Amino acid sequence: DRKAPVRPTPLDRVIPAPASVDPGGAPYRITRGTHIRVDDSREARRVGDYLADLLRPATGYRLPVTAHGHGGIRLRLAGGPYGDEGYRLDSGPAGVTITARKAAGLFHGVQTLRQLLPPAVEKDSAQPGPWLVAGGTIEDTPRYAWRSAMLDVSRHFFGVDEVKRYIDRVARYKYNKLHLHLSDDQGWRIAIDSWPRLATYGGSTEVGGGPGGYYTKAEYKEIVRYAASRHLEVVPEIDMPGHTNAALASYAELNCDGVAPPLYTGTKVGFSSLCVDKDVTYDFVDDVIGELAALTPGRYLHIGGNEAHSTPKADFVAFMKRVQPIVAKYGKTVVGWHQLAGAEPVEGALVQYWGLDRTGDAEKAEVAEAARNGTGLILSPADRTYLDMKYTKDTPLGLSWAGYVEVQRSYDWDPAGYLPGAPADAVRGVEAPLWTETLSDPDQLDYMAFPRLPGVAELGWSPASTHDWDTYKVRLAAQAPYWEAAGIDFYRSPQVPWT
């Protein structure tokens, strides 16, 4: 009875592990006449319609969303100790109620609810159910405010619909930020009016050659809108000064030797660099950042800064000293990979640490020092949360330069004491990056994203006290029938006792 359990799933059996779970009493049962009651507001109805859409196909029920009556499923905004993202979920024969201070909290509550329901909820046709929700109370709030997932759309391009699909994958686990790697050596994926060829030429191909692609302003705005409806703040990244071949290949004038390199379709890194000695370089950067900021309702702008191996240290420092201020000029908060820690991060900046266990002490120290100096830290270790890394030497996709990363390794650590010498309060959160040198279609993204994606979300959300591999793997194992029913391919790790 994997698909349709006789009894409801435990109230605590959800990912991320809720901060507080108190089971008790009988469960709630959704029946054909259940109404979804919300407050009389645009945002309230929005979360209501979202929930209704998730349930209607499998239940076959009408599930009307209204601001009147005592619906069996109630979503209500009210004062409480749940912050901007927390919520309380009460379940019993009298109905299910999700309470929170803001819509994001109600949305997160819904993500928990879909896990309390049986695997059959993932189907597209009416299912027998039963649509049981364990009885009790859940009070949930996040540990970290930065809980993101990154999708590399530069190595292999993924269109708007494919990005919306990935957005829905991550929304399941309460991630609240979507980092889009919009440019690299193999492609430039966002239209810039001031520099037209970046997209029309720089986005013409991808890894392996053939058709590439890019987002027009309208397409990008739609991705941002959709992400916002899933409560994901979009963090766009235009990598500089390295990983800039797409731009360099588009405008010869940007190159040091004034010669535009060919479009790149390989899978290596570190060979490209903007010419730090030319003034046109900074006009280019200013125009791009200004236009990107205009399309970014979010608070952050990622300027990358990684693997600029063709940029001498001194030039890299000079470059960053000059470009960082540009971000604030357009009202945004700068974010960069941890190499930025060696180039004097400006006030308010955040750096994304992608180091490994084996990374040298000197490098880790430079990052820890930045944290001491007030720089916020986003943790995404290459040997922990890089979803493109192989599980084992036999994995058919992905890379292995950072070693192999099985499910336990990806999950089994604590962000608070990860980077030696780094102040715990400097850690803003975590991120799970999905690089695409080896992934060209949505199904391949899923196989590399699952089952590690939920684990990283837990690290960003759950209390340290709830962290434990032996009990977590049981909760992860329970996701099997849901993913199977949803058509989400995933790596059946032998470390997990799959249900």
User: Closest CB to ligand NAG among 15 and 246?
Assistant: 246
User: Closest CB to ligand NAG among 90 and 431?
Assistant: 431
Q: How far apart are CA 237 and CA 242, in angstroms?
A: 12
Which partner from the list Cl ion, ligand NAG, none does 360 bind, CB cut-off 5 to 8 Å by kind?
A: none
When asked if residue 443 is in the footprint of Cl ion (CB under 5 A), the reply is no
Which partner from the list Cl ion, ligand NAG, none does 266 bind, CB cut-off 5 to 8 Å by kind?
A: Cl ion
Which partner from the list ligand NAG, Cl ion, none does 437 bind, CB cut-off 5 to 8 Å by kind?
A: ligand NAG
Q: How far is the CB of 214 from ligand NAG (least distance, A)?
A: 19
Q: How far is the CB of 252 from ligand NAG (least distance, A)?
A: 24
| 335-354 residues near Cl ion, rule: CB under 5 A | none
Task: Name the nearest CA neighbour of 257 among 269, 239, 272.
Answer: 272
Under the rule (CB under 6 A), what is the footprint of ligand NAG? 269, 306-307, 337, 354, 382, 386, 388, 399, 435, 437
With CB atoms as reference, the residue minimizing the distance to Cl ion is 266
User: Closest CB to ligand NAG among 213 and 398?
Assistant: 398
When asked if residue 266 is in the footprint of Cl ion (CB under 5 A), the reply is yes
String of contacts with Cl ion for each residue 219-258, x by CB under 5 A: ----------------------------------------
Which partner from the list Cl ion, ligand NAG, none does 268 bind, CB cut-off 5 to 8 Å by kind?
A: Cl ion
User: Closest CB to ligand NAG among 61 and 418?
Assistant: 418
Q: Which of 22, 168, 277, 441 binds Cl ion (CB under 5 A)?
A: 168
Q: How far is the CB of 114 from Cl ion (least distance, A)?
A: 10
Q: How far is the CB of 175 from Cl ion (least distance, A)?
A: 12
Which partner from the list ligand NAG, Cl ion, none does 399 bind, CB cut-off 5 to 8 Å by kind?
A: ligand NAG
Count of C-beta atoms within a 10 Å radius of residue 384: 27
Contacting range for Cl ion; rule: CB under 5 A; set: 226-234, 267-275, 298-306, 375-383: 267-275
CA angle 293, 299, 302 (to 5 degrees): 65
Q: Which long-range contacts (CB under 8 A, 24 or more apart) does 205-211 make?
A: 205/263, 205/265, 206/154, 206/155, 206/156, 206/157, 206/265, 207/155, 207/156, 207/265, 207/266, 207/267, 207/436, 207/437, 207/440, 208/156, 208/265, 208/440, 209/265
Which partner from the list Cl ion, ligand NAG, none does 193 bind, CB cut-off 5 to 8 Å by kind?
A: none
User: Closest CB to ligand NAG among 257 and 394?
Assistant: 394
Q: How far is the CB of 18 from ligand NAG (least distance, A)?
A: 32
Q: Are 262 and 249 in contact (CB under 8 A)?
A: yes
Which partner from the list Cl ion, ligand NAG, none does 286 bind, CB cut-off 5 to 8 Å by kind?
A: none
String of contacts with Cl ion for each residue 53-82, x by CB under 5 A: ------------------------------
User: Closest CB to Cl ion among 164 and 217?
Assistant: 164
User: Closest CB to Cl ion among 266 and 325?
Assistant: 266
Which partner from the list ligand NAG, Cl ion, none does 101 bind, CB cut-off 5 to 8 Å by kind?
A: none
Which partner from the list Cl ion, ligand NAG, none does 42 bind, CB cut-off 5 to 8 Å by kind?
A: none
Give residues with Cβ within 8 angstroms of 200, minimum separation 6. 214
Is 307 annotated in the active site?
A: yes
Contacting range for Cl ion; rule: CB under 5 A; set: 127-135, 188-196, 249-257, 261-269: 261-269
User: Closest CB to ligand NAG among 287 and 307?
Assistant: 307
Q: How far apart are CA 219 and CA 234, in angstroms?
A: 14
Q: How far is the CB of 326 from Cl ion (least distance, A)?
A: 29
Tokens of 347: 């006030």
Catalytic one of 307, 344, 366, 484: 307
Place of tokens 């009070």: 139
User: Closest CB to ligand NAG among 307 and 489?
Assistant: 307
Q: How far is the CB of 94 from ligand NAG (least distance, A)?
A: 50
With CB atoms as reference, the residue minimizing the distance to ligand NAG is 306
Q: Which of 42, 68, 70, 268 binds Cl ion (CB under 5 A)?
A: 268
Q: How far is the CB of 253 from ligand NAG (least distance, A)?
A: 25
Q: Which residues are catalytic?
A: 307
Binding site for Cl ion (CB under 5 A): 168-169, 266, 268-269
